[PDB]
């Protein structure tokens with residue numbers, strides 16, 4: 001449709017259905033996942049979110065992004081720091097992995113935040129709305145599999161405490177995305193950047209898959 005929110009959904013249906021077939025994501029999705037694979041996923045998210053939130057901060061007051069700036073409701077860095085401290089220990093920052101696929105993703109986020117700010121919404125959409133939608137099933141799959149102890153940590157990332165209702169926040173976020181002012185060309189590039197975002201994720205999984213199995 002003409003609403004950016006609906007245009008994004010429709011345009012990424014293909015790459016999303018594709019992602020549901022990426023081995024690593026297939027296995028996780030079907031209950032196949034280990035502590036080592038999970039840790040890798042979490043490390044990935046950490047690096048991705050640090051770069052994403054760094055660029056959102058740089059462009060928070062710009063009209064190309066301000067409407068979708070929800071620091072309190074969406075920030076994920078702090079939750080990932082908590083989780084990684086549990087998964088990798090007190091010196092997690094010194095030992096977490098930083099792979100080519102992770103760097104590739106981070107590189108585009110910075111390129112976008114510094115030279116093509118008008119496209120940052122596409123990356124925020126792909127990450128936030130997605131993680132917000134995959135949250136429940138994933139944390140549940142994690143619990144029922146990882147056989148965690150009873151320390152109450154490691155899964156903070158899957159809970160957005162500052163969002164009372166995910167479905168209601170989704171409406172609000174879509175509405176803010178649709179309030180953004182953009183020319184037909186920018187709008188087109190935003191859609192294409194979203195596809196690029198999915199691809200970065202899909203190829204990140206293909207790497208985590210290659211890495212896990214040796």
Ligand code: HEM
Pocket residue numbers: 005008009016019020021025026029125126127129130131133134198201202
């Ligand atoms: C591994 C398999 C995956 C499954 C089973 C899955 C499942 C879902 C589900 C059930 C929704 C439906 C939301 C609705 O009710 O409309 C959704 C939304 C979404 N997913 Fe995934 N997903 C997967 C992978 C991905 C990946 C790799 C990304 C990108 C990191 C992603 C990004 C999104 C986004 C952006 C939405 C928002 C849709 C909207 O515009 O409303 N998903 N996903």
